[PDB]
Amino acid sequence: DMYIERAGDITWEKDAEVTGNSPRLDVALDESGDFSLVE
Amino acid sequence: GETTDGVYRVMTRRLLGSTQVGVGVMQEGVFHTMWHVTKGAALRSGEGRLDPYWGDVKQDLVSYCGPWKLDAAWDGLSEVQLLAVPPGERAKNIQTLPGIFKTKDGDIGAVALDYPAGTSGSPILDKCGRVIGLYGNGVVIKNGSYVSAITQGKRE
Numbered sequence: 001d002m003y004i005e006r007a008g009d010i011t012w013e014k015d016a017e018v019t020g021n022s023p024r025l026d027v028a029l030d031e032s033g034d035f036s037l038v039e
Numbered sequence: 040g041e042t043t044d045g046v047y048r049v050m051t052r053r054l055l056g057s058t059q060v061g062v063g064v065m066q067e068g069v070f071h072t073m074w075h076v077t078k079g080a081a082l083r084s085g086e087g088r089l090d091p092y093w094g095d096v097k098q099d100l101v102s103y104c105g106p107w108k109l110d111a112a113w114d115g116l117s118e119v120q121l122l123a124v125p126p127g128e129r130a131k132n133i134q135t136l137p138g139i140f141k142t143k144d145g146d147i148g149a150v151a152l153d154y155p156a157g158t159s160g161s162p163i164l165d166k167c168g169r170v171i172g173l174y175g176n177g178v179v180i181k182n183g184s185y186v187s188a189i190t191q192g193k194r195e
């Protein structure tokens with residue numbers, strides 16, 4: 001049986017850690033909601 | 040149980056100890072998460088029960104107690120923050136510039152941040168603190184790391 005626990009407020013944080021790149025990927029989405037890469 | 044707006048962990052006592060299967064957003068008395076987190080099962084909040092209201096396996100979204108309320112969208116230009124809630128770890132905001140998933144039905148924002156699968160359902164925010172989508176449905180690239188779509192539902 002699944003249960004929920006509060007973890008925080010939803011707010012923008014000034015000066016948060018900035019990481020990650022911005023890739024442009026060609027993808028396909030199937031009936032089961034699964035993405036796959038089209039290359 | 041607790042119905043205060045905010046981010047929540049989705050836990051299960053079915054496996055060894057207490058396991059985090061995902062995350063969700065409580066907004067306007069409705070709990071929003073990804074379909075693959077709960078598979079549409081009922082949830083408990085304290086002594087109260089949350090029943091599914093709407094869901095779709097292809098969008099990979101589900102709402103409890105009422106219809107999907109989140110409708111903010113990534114503007115296509117600005118940075119965003121993933122409010123990551125990883126298993127056993129404190130909620131932390133991570134800022135990033137989204138990439139793009141190009142599909143036959145249009146483009147969608149994507150966040151290139153890799154976290155354990157039990158982080159699925161963590162909200163992605165704009166600079167006003169509005170939830171523009173949830174993190175946790177995407178693809179595995181050459182490196183073995185994850186790139187998630189910014190998945191948003193429709194507010195009827």
Ligand SMILES: O=C(Nc1ccc2c(c1)CNC2)c1cc(Br)cc2[nH]ccc12
Binds near residue numbers: 075175
């Ligand atoms: O598997 C993941 N997500 C998922 C699972 C099941 C389904 C869907 C998406 C949509 N259709 C059913 C996942 C999520 C995250 Br945050 C990091 C990940 N690293 C590797 C997989 C992964």
